[PDB]
Design an enzyme around this catalytic site. Structure first.
Site, short mmCIF file in Angstrom:
data_model
loop_
_atom_site.label_atom_id
_atom_site.label_comp_id
_atom_site.label_asym_id
_atom_site.label_seq_id
_atom_site.Cartn_x
_atom_site.Cartn_y
_atom_site.Cartn_z
N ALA A 11 29.11 14.09 -6.99
CA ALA A 11 28.41 12.82 -7.25
C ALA A 11 27.07 13.08 -7.95
O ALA A 11 26.50 14.16 -7.84
CB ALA A 11 28.20 12.04 -5.94
N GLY A 19 10.65 5.56 -2.03
CA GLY A 19 10.36 5.84 -0.62
C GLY A 19 10.09 4.58 0.19
O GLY A 19 9.57 3.59 -0.33
N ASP A 44 15.30 5.77 -0.53
CA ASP A 44 15.24 6.70 0.60
C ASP A 44 14.84 5.93 1.87
O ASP A 44 13.76 5.32 1.91
CB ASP A 44 14.22 7.82 0.34
CG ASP A 44 14.19 8.82 1.49
OD1 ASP A 44 15.16 9.58 1.61
OD2 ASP A 44 13.25 8.76 2.32
N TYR A 49 12.01 4.60 10.42
CA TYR A 49 11.02 3.80 9.67
C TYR A 49 10.96 2.35 10.12
O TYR A 49 10.04 1.63 9.74
CB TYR A 49 11.28 3.86 8.14
CG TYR A 49 11.27 5.26 7.55
CD1 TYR A 49 10.73 6.34 8.26
CD2 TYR A 49 11.78 5.50 6.28
CE1 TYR A 49 10.72 7.64 7.70
CE2 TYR A 49 11.80 6.80 5.72
CZ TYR A 49 11.26 7.84 6.43
OH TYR A 49 11.28 9.11 5.88
N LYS A 78 18.83 8.95 7.30
CA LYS A 78 18.58 10.19 8.04
C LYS A 78 18.82 9.96 9.52
O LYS A 78 18.50 8.89 10.05
CB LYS A 78 17.14 10.67 7.84
CG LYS A 78 16.65 10.51 6.38
CD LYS A 78 15.35 11.28 6.16
CE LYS A 78 14.64 10.90 4.85
NZ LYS A 78 14.16 9.46 4.83
N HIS A 111 17.31 14.58 9.86
CA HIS A 111 15.91 14.25 9.49
C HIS A 111 14.96 15.41 9.71
O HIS A 111 14.12 15.70 8.87
CB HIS A 111 15.44 13.01 10.27
CG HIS A 111 14.31 12.25 9.62
ND1 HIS A 111 14.18 10.88 9.72
CD2 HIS A 111 13.27 12.67 8.87
CE1 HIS A 111 13.09 10.50 9.08
NE2 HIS A 111 12.53 11.56 8.52
N1 LIG Z 1 12.21 13.62 5.35
C1 LIG Z 1 10.97 13.46 5.80
O1 LIG Z 1 10.60 14.05 6.82
C2 LIG Z 1 10.00 12.62 5.02
C3 LIG Z 1 10.41 11.77 4.01
N2 LIG Z 1 9.50 11.05 3.33
C4 LIG Z 1 9.98 10.13 2.24
O2 LIG Z 1 9.17 10.31 1.08
C5 LIG Z 1 8.59 9.05 0.68
C6 LIG Z 1 7.28 9.25 -0.09
O3 LIG Z 1 6.36 9.94 0.75
P1 LIG Z 1 5.13 9.18 1.47
O4 LIG Z 1 4.67 10.11 2.56
O5 LIG Z 1 5.49 7.79 1.89
O6 LIG Z 1 3.89 9.07 0.43
P2 LIG Z 1 3.67 9.13 -1.16
O7 LIG Z 1 3.20 10.52 -1.49
O8 LIG Z 1 4.82 8.59 -1.93
O9 LIG Z 1 2.39 8.16 -1.28
C7 LIG Z 1 2.49 6.78 -0.95
C8 LIG Z 1 1.11 6.19 -1.13
O10 LIG Z 1 0.78 6.24 -2.52
C9 LIG Z 1 0.41 4.94 -2.97
N3 LIG Z 1 0.87 4.84 -4.37
C10 LIG Z 1 2.15 4.79 -4.80
N4 LIG Z 1 2.14 4.71 -6.15
C11 LIG Z 1 0.85 4.72 -6.56
C12 LIG Z 1 0.26 4.65 -7.82
N5 LIG Z 1 1.03 4.56 -8.95
N6 LIG Z 1 -1.10 4.68 -7.90
C13 LIG Z 1 -1.86 4.76 -6.79
N7 LIG Z 1 -1.31 4.82 -5.56
C14 LIG Z 1 0.05 4.81 -5.44
C15 LIG Z 1 1.10 3.99 -2.02
O11 LIG Z 1 0.42 2.74 -1.94
P3 LIG Z 1 1.17 1.31 -1.86
O12 LIG Z 1 2.47 1.49 -1.11
O13 LIG Z 1 0.10 0.51 -1.14
O14 LIG Z 1 1.35 0.82 -3.28
C16 LIG Z 1 1.05 4.75 -0.71
O15 LIG Z 1 -0.22 4.51 -0.04
C17 LIG Z 1 8.46 8.34 2.02
O16 LIG Z 1 8.23 6.93 1.91
C18 LIG Z 1 9.80 8.67 2.64
O17 LIG Z 1 10.82 7.84 2.02
C19 LIG Z 1 8.18 11.13 3.58
C20 LIG Z 1 7.70 11.95 4.61
C21 LIG Z 1 8.64 12.70 5.34
O1 LIG Z 2 9.61 11.92 9.44
C1 LIG Z 2 9.30 11.13 8.53
O2 LIG Z 2 10.05 10.87 7.58
C2 LIG Z 2 7.95 10.47 8.54
N1 LIG Z 2 7.12 11.11 9.58
C3 LIG Z 2 6.68 12.38 9.58
C4 LIG Z 2 5.92 12.63 10.72
C5 LIG Z 2 5.30 13.95 11.08
C6 LIG Z 2 6.30 14.84 11.82
N2 LIG Z 2 6.25 16.17 12.01
C7 LIG Z 2 7.31 16.65 12.72
C8 LIG Z 2 7.59 17.94 13.10
F1 LIG Z 2 6.70 18.85 12.72
C9 LIG Z 2 8.73 18.27 13.83
F2 LIG Z 2 8.96 19.57 14.16
C10 LIG Z 2 9.63 17.27 14.19
C11 LIG Z 2 9.35 15.94 13.82
F3 LIG Z 2 10.23 14.99 14.19
C12 LIG Z 2 8.19 15.64 13.08
S1 LIG Z 2 7.74 14.09 12.52
C13 LIG Z 2 5.89 11.46 11.46
C14 LIG Z 2 5.30 11.08 12.67
C15 LIG Z 2 5.50 9.76 13.09
C16 LIG Z 2 6.26 8.87 12.33
N3 LIG Z 2 6.83 9.23 11.15
C17 LIG Z 2 6.68 10.49 10.68
#
Ligand SMILES: NC(=O)C1=CN([C@@H]2O[C@H](COP(=O)(O)OP(=O)(O)OC[C@H]3O[C@@H](n4cnc5c(N)ncnc54)[C@H](OP(=O)(O)O)[C@@H]3O)[C@@H](O)[C@H]2O)C=CC1
Ligand SMILES: O=C(O)Cn1cc(Cc2nc3c(F)c(F)cc(F)c3s2)c2cccnc21
Length: 316
Positions: A11, A19, A44, A49, A78, A111
């Site tokens: 795919a 995000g 995503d 969330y 996730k 996740h």
């Molecule tokens: N698997 C995992 O453990 C994780 C997955 N993720 C995924 O990754 C996605 C992105 O990461 P995330 O941590 O949310 O943060 P980002 O690094 O994408 O930053 C988001 C921030 O940037 C701002 N922003 C976005 N575009 C602009 C722009 N063009 N100019 C200025 N500011 C901007 C947003 O403001 P606003 O929204 O107010 O416009 C928000 O405050 C998450 O939403 C999630 O889907 C994230 C963390 C962990």
């Molecule tokens: O996981 C995401 O996608 C977004 N997200 C990330 C964090 C920080 C975390 N760090 C760890 C971590 F270091 C772990 F080992 C296990 C976890 F589940 C988390 S979650 C978080 C806390 C609280 C709520 N959301 C969170």
């Protein structure tokens, strides 16, 4: 470049997605509608969330309006840490499918590698604030994820926040049926992840970069923290190309053959973030951006550092 990357299930995954972590339920429906209108085809999501129902409302409206067909969308969710037990994985996936109002996911990720005690709390803590682990291991959870592919609930499965030793454990699993398609990890100029990215790419695993803008809205941000969007060195690179710093920060992972998922709920930023296919960063720009690495990690939690499968003790 091409707008989609080929996965090991055959795919194609759009290299730019939207995000949804921290996107409030009252604003995420509009955010996803606008994103689909301006060209996004990859969203995503995650159960943790707490906004998958509202994301689903947007997707359904755009399908009904005939702006897009289901086949054109790439929807990712996730499995949360409290559902690592073999018998809870299917139920967790079905709840996500129900909220998103879909009959399959394109990709479903573990996740985090850490399993937590099952229950209604997302982060079950003990009397002194340590997360309470479950006695599950990564390999048994993987086998339950493989079942979802065979039952047609998901097209591809993957992992998120796995270190190279943890990826290795899956690749060496006795009776491995489906290899992980994707490892989704934190990646930006302050945490460049060269070693882990090289490892994953060499095994044919696609890497998705999360928090590409450094997650300035993360709840634990402190005013003295580094800010990528305000880094004057990145500002100068943006200025040279007549693009915004956010556009440079999104283009950066794309040129490393990564998928990237910036989050926004602001319609004008949603549109701005998509306008990244009409310029290139030079080899020199790329090497310079890589030079800014400081091993600065935004997503980690102190309460989890005693878990046996905590992923960030290893170098990579
Ligand atoms: N698997 C995992 O453990 C994780 C997955 N993720 C995924 O990754 C996605 C992105 O990461 P995330 O941590 O949310 O943060 P980002 O690094 O994408 O930053 C988001 C921030 O940037 C701002 N922003 C976005 N575009 C602009 C722009 N063009 N100019 C200025 N500011 C901007 C947003 O403001 P606003 O929204 O107010 O416009 C928000 O405050 C998450 O939403 C999630 O889907 C994230 C963390 C962990
Ligand atoms: O996981 C995401 O996608 C977004 N997200 C990330 C964090 C920080 C975390 N760090 C760890 C971590 F270091 C772990 F080992 C296990 C976890 F589940 C988390 S979650 C978080 C806390 C609280 C709520 N959301 C969170």
């Amino acid at each position: 470049m091409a707008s989609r990357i080929l996965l090991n299930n055959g795919a194609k995954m759009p290299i730019l997605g939207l995000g949804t972590w921290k996107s409030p339920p009252g604003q995420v429906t509009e955010a996803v509608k606008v994103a689909i209108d301006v060209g996004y085809r990859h969203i995503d999501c995650a159960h943790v969330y707490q906004n998958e129902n509202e994301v689903g409302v947007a997707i359904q409206e755009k399908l009904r309006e005939q702006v897009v067909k289901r086949e054109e969308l790439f929807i990712v969710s996730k499995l949360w840490c409290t559902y690592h037990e073999k018998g809870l994985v299917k139920g967790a996936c079905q709840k996500t499918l129900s909220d998103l109002k879909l009959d399959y996911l394109d990709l479903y990720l573990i996740h985090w590698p850490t399993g937590f005690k099952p229950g209604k709390e997302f982060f079950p803590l003990d009397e002194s604030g340590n997360v309470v682990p479950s006695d599950t291991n990564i390999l048994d959870t993987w086998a339950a994820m493989e079942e979802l592919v065979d039952e047609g609930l998901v097209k591809a499965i993957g992992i998120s926040n796995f270190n190279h030793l943890q990826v290795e454990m899956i690749l060496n699993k006795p009776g491995l049926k489906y290899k992980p398609a994707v490892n989704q990890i934190e990646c930006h100029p302050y945490l460049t992840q060269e070693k882990l990215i090289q490892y994953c790419q060499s095994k044919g695993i696609v890497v998705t970069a999360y928090s590409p803008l450094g997650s300035p809205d993360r709840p634990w941000a402190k005013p003295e923290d580094p800010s990528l969007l305000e880094d004057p060195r990145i500002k100068a690179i943006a200025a040279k190309h007549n693009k915004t710093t956010a556009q440079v920060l999104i283009r950066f992972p794309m040129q490393r053959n990564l998928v990237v998922i910036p989050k926004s709920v602001t319609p004008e930023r949603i549109a701005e973030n998509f306008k990244v296919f009409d310029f290139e960063l030079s080899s020199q720009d790329m090497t310079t951006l890589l030079s800014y690495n400081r091993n600065w990690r935004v997503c980690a939690l102190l309460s989890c550092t005693s878990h046996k499968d905590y992923p960030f003790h290893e170098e990579f």
